[PDB]
Write a protein that binds this ligand. Structure first.
Ligand SMILES: *[C@@H]1O[C@H](CO)[C@@H](O[C@@H]2O[C@H](CO)[C@@H](O)[C@H](O)[C@H]2NC(C)=O)[C@H](O)[C@H]1NC(C)=O
Ligand SMILES: *[C@@H]1O[C@H](CO)[C@@H](O[C@@H]2O[C@H](CO)[C@@H](O)[C@H](O)[C@H]2NC(C)=O)[C@H](O)[C@H]1NC(C)=O
Ligand SMILES: *[C@@H]1O[C@H](CO)[C@@H](O)[C@H](O)[C@H]1NC(C)=O
Ligand SMILES: *[C@@H]1O[C@H](CO)[C@@H](O)[C@H](O)[C@H]1NC(C)=O
Ligand SMILES: *[C@@H]1O[C@H](CO)[C@@H](O)[C@H](O)[C@H]1NC(C)=O
Ligand SMILES: *[C@@H]1O[C@H](CO)[C@@H](O)[C@H](O)[C@H]1NC(C)=O
Ligand SMILES: *[C@@H]1O[C@H](CO)[C@@H](O)[C@H](O)[C@H]1NC(C)=O
Ligand SMILES: *[C@@H]1O[C@H](CO)[C@@H](O)[C@H](O)[C@H]1NC(C)=O
Ligand SMILES: *[C@@H]1O[C@H](CO)[C@@H](O)[C@H](O)[C@H]1NC(C)=O
Lengths: 361, 254, 120, 50, 50, 49
């Protein structure tokens, strides 16, 4: 009170000095069920992968994507992102994801990179200089390789011009190494552009086949259908907690509600447009949001020339939520309630007054 | 497959009164015993709505401008109206949205379709005739859901294209009126929001033929247009919208 | 509960103190107004149990003993006909004590004339 | 952005407190009139017309 | 630019309305006094000095 | 008549409604003042000729 009044002596009276707050104890985040997962199981762990000149493009959209399972997997020998962060894939949202799956040689795994120049980069699969997303690659020597040699995986070796980014070329036109006319007829200086790899189990690390899936992100004016997973915690009721329900955040006491919502409705508002009712997204139940018991802290004292004894009034606060006496004005702590009636010395309110004789109310 | 329908009877379109129909819930918020004033794309009260018939020989499937929104009212028996045609140029140059309800399920597709000039379905007296498209080249969005559906049933629909969101509001109402729109109040619940992200400027209703040439089953539908205005909506104790005030209709409601 | 907002609000100084002090002045002014209007007597008078006033009837303005609020029928009708950091402070005088003050004024002006307002 | 919200809400609160002070002055005038009527009409007989 | 002009003109209009409310309170007090003089000096003879 | 100005002014809420309400209260208070001062009789008395 001396701090509030900016004086070392306090006259007899009641002084509103501070504001009692019921401090929030827990944080409750309730987010709805993580269903309709993106089909990453049929892209990363498919039966047969495609070649690099005809890389399979899968459109990932209208689903929730769990990148934590993909990132925490130890089977992947390369997880390099060029436009985003690996730990923020579960937090960011994108319109759609393009998944480009192919098989290349182990020495060409570095060639799927922005600014990198190679045969796979120039003729088979090209990334832009402003590429966003992550390149994921893992060894597949136990599956793709054959003891007789796996010749099914072809790759383009020759083309007149370099690729544009995200451009396919499945054409089988005979390349002209020299300047002799070739009408599709092979000769001394005219070769077929697609050659087969030599994947065998006796080759070392670098010639083993590597399966690569490249995820590219689009951030167009379409709505961000692809988002990360939501980790909802348990629900705690009857306590002043910080609630986060489907992006609507706040602080309040969450109690059971008798308001029967219609099934399309999620939140509830009173006359003054404050959210006082809500539906939990996990379990379809209705909860009332009572605001925490904020109150004004008033100090009832005589003069400091008389005495230093004080009493504290918590306005509109029940005495079980803070010489303790319950008034209609609030809870009064430090005053002895008596049955006698005197004239009003210090007004408390609702017919209650305080006086010094100790402090009585 | 496309078929020209050349046995139509020429007749000008009709007009009738909207009364107090076309109201929908503006948001997902429960409100109890309160009056809420909201600014949104709403259908004007007592407005001039375009009235189309299907009777035998009338078969009204034209293409109309979408404007800012479409209120679709359906006085329906025996399920003649099955879907709608959404797009801008209605050819393979642009991307179009297809809503169909055939004999099994409802299919929602966003693709590059080649629409026929006269698209329809057909029921043989059993549904065994689908002539609404000839091709489907580049699809971006597919969504299969639960089926939405004297005139006995009343079907209200609101279609809105706001910020790439396609809002479908609907309400089923049991009526027994013969010819025109009944007079009453019924707020439309939100059914499904569609992430389409496409331009739509023109629309077309899809009807169904009856085969036993072709015969048109008895049906009538109504097109209203959504305009930006203010409604004062009344929420009862149970939280349903029971009455509304159009703030720009007359000075009393103002 | 935003601490950054309060840190930015401390740049504006003692505006909140002035608003709270003005509202506190209004709040004590209301109690002073009620004190000046109704508490004009320091003796709580009662009517006699026998209501023999020479044919004059005051039952509609005297307090009803059957009602728990101890209000007159007219006062009961008057009370029936009137229907984020925000707090409402209760008034210092309750409605029962304001009714008691009006009952004392009525008993004084019925039994004693204007003599109780100028002395004994 | 918070500074914009702070100055808007502070202007709203100052407007509310100003109109509350004006209404408090009006209610104080009415209550002074009511105390005058309590003193002169109830506690005595007044010669003042109307 | 319109935000600066709007807050300047809104502050000017709020100042004008506050001054009009204070002057209306003063004129209401003067009119209550004038009604009291109409009741007590015209409709009757007043014993109140001056 | 600038519609962009009114679109920006709607972000500030109901200040304009408050000012119009205060001015309307003053405007009806003036008529109440004149009614209280001058209309103290319901009979229009006339002097003799
Ligand atoms: C149904 O009628 C429409 C309109 O008469 C036909 O559309 C025209 O078809 C001709 C055929 O070559 C084109 O040259 C025109 O450009 C088309 N007009 C329009 C506006 O598209 C349609 O082909 C007919 N259906 C069938 C199956 O013949
Ligand atoms: C004074 O007035 C009251 C109310 O007008 C009278 O009480 C009524 O008495 C009659 C017959 O005794 C009843 O039928 C009414 O119902 C009473 N009215 C109420 C409101 O209770 C009362 O009789 C009058 N006289 C005295 C001496 O008290
Ligand atoms: C969501 O998950 C919860 C898990 O407790 C389950 O009870 C509920 O049935 C699921 N579905 C819906 C629609 O809430
Ligand atoms: C194959 O990869 C998918 C990636 O989505 C993963 O979910 C699945 O568990 C993998 N299969 C095995 C056997 O680990
Ligand atoms: C509706 O429009 C048509 C044509 O525009 C017109 O003839 C008719 O009178 C209109 N109806 C009403 C009620 O305005
Ligand atoms: C309804 O349409 C869907 C997709 O257009 C199709 O798969 C299904 O077979 C159709 N139903 C019938 C009965 O033809
Ligand atoms: C759209 O379809 C046409 C023909 O089917 C094709 O040539 C074109 O590449 C497609 N475009 C996209 C973006 O899929
Ligand atoms: C939508 O289409 C119409 C007509 O085809 C055109 O005028 C308008 O500019 C288009 N809008 C967008 C955002 O492309
Ligand atoms: C509200 O619902 C109750 C049933 O719980 C019903 O008795 C009452 O009539 C309903 N009120 C309205 C206005 O529909």
């Amino acid at each position: 009170t001396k701090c509030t009044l900016k004086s070392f002596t306090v006259e007899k009276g009641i002084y509103q000095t501070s504001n009692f707050r019921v401090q929030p104890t827990e944080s409750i985040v309730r987010f709805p069920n993580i269903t309709n997962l993106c089909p990453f199981g049929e892209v990363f762990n498919a039966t047969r992968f495609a070649s690099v000149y005809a890389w399979n493009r899968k459109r990932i959209s209208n689903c929730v994507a769990d990148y934590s399972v993909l990132y925490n997997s130890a089977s992947f020998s390369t997880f390099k992102c060029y436009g985003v962060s690996p730990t923020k894939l579960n937090d960011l949202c994108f319109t759609n994801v393009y998944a480009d799956s192919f098989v290349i040689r182990g020495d060409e795994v570095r060639q799927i990179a922005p600014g990198q120049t190679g045969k796979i980069a120039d003729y088979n699969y090209k990334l832009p200089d402003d590429f966003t997303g992550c390149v994921i690659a893992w060894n597949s020597n136990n599956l793709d390789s054959k003891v007789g040699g796996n010749y099914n995986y072809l790759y383009r070796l020759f083309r007149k011009s370099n690729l544009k980014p995200f451009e396919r070329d499945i054409s089988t036109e005979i390349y002209q190494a020299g300047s002799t006319p070739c009408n599709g007829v092979k000769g001394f200086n005219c070769y077929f552009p697609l050659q087969s790899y030599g994947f065998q189990p006796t080759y070392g690390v670098g010639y083993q086949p590597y399966r690569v899936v490249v995820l590219s992100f689009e951030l167009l004016h379409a709505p961000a259908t692809v988002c990360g997973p939501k980790k909802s915690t348990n629900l705690v009721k009857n306590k002043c907690v910080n609630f986060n329900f489907n992006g609507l955040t706040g602080t309040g006491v969450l109690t059971e509600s008798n308001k029967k919502f219609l099934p399309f409705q999620q939140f509830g508002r009173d006359i003054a447009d404050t959210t006082d009712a809500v539906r939990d997204p996990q379990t379809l139940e209705i909860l009332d949001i009572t605001p925490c018991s904020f109150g004004g802290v008033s100090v009832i004292t005589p003069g400091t020339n008389t005495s230093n004894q004080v009493a504290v009034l918590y306005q509109g606060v029940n005495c079980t939520e803070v010489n303790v006496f319950q008034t209609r004005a609030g809870c009064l702590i430090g005053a002895e309630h008596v049955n006698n009636s005197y004239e009003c010395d210090i007004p408390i309110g609702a017919g209650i007054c305080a006086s010094y004789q100790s402090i009585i109310a | 497959q496309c078929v020209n329908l050349t046995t139509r009877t020429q007749l000008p379109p009709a007009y009738t009164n909207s009364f107090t129909r076309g109201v929908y819930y503006p948001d997902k918020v429960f409100r109890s015993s309160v009056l809420h004033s909201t600014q949104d794309l709403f259908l004007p009260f007592f407005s001039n709505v375009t009235w189309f018939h299907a009777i035998h020989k009338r078969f009204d499937n034209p293409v109309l401008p979408f404007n800012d929104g479409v209120y679709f009212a359906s006085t329906e028996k025996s399920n003649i109206i099955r879907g709608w045609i959404f797009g801008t140029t209605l050819d393979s140059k642009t991307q179009s949205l297809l809503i169909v309800n055939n004999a099994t399920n409802v299919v929602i597709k966003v693709c590059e379709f080649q629409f026929c000039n006269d698209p329809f379905l057909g029921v043989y007296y059993m549904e065994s005739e689908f002539r609404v498209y000839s091709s489907a080249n580049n699809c971006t969005f597919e969504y299969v859901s639960q089926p939405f559906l004297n005139f006995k049933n009343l079907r209200e629909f609101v279609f809105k294209n706001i910020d790439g969101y396609f809002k479908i509001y609907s309400k089923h109402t049991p009526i027994n009126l013969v010819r025109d729109l009944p007079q009453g109040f019924s707020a439309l619940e939100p059914l499904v929001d569609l992430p389409i992200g496409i331009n739509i400027t023109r629309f077309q209703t899809l009807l169904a033929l009856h085969r036993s040439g072709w015969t048109a089953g008895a049906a009538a539908y109504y097109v209203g247009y959504l305009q930006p205005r203010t409604f004062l909506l009344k929420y009862n104790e149970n939280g349903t919208i029971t009455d509304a005030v159009d703030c720009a209709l007359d000075p009393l409601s103002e | 509960d935003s601490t950054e907002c309060s840190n930015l609000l401390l740049q504006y100084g003692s505006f909140c103190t002035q608003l709270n002090r003005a509202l506190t002045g209004i709040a004590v002014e209301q109690d002073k107004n009620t004190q000046e209007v109704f508490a004009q007597v320091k003796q709580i008078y009662k009517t006699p149990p026998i209501k023999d006033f020479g044919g004059f009837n005051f039952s509609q303005i005297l307090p009803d003993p059957s009602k728990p609020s101890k209000r007159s029928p007219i006062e009961d009708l008057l009370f029936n006909k009137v229907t984020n950091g925000l707090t409402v402070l209760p008034p210092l005088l309750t409605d029962e004590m304001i009714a008691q003050y009006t009952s004392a004024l009525l008993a004084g002006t019925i039994t004693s004339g204007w003599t109780f307002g100028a002395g004994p | 952005q918070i500074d914009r919200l702070i100055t808007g809400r502070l202007q709203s609160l100052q407007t509310y407190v100003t109109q509350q002070l004006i209404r408090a002055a009006e209610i104080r005038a009415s209550a002074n009139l009511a105390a005058t009527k309590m003193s002169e009409c109830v506690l005595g007989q007044s010669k003042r017309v109307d």
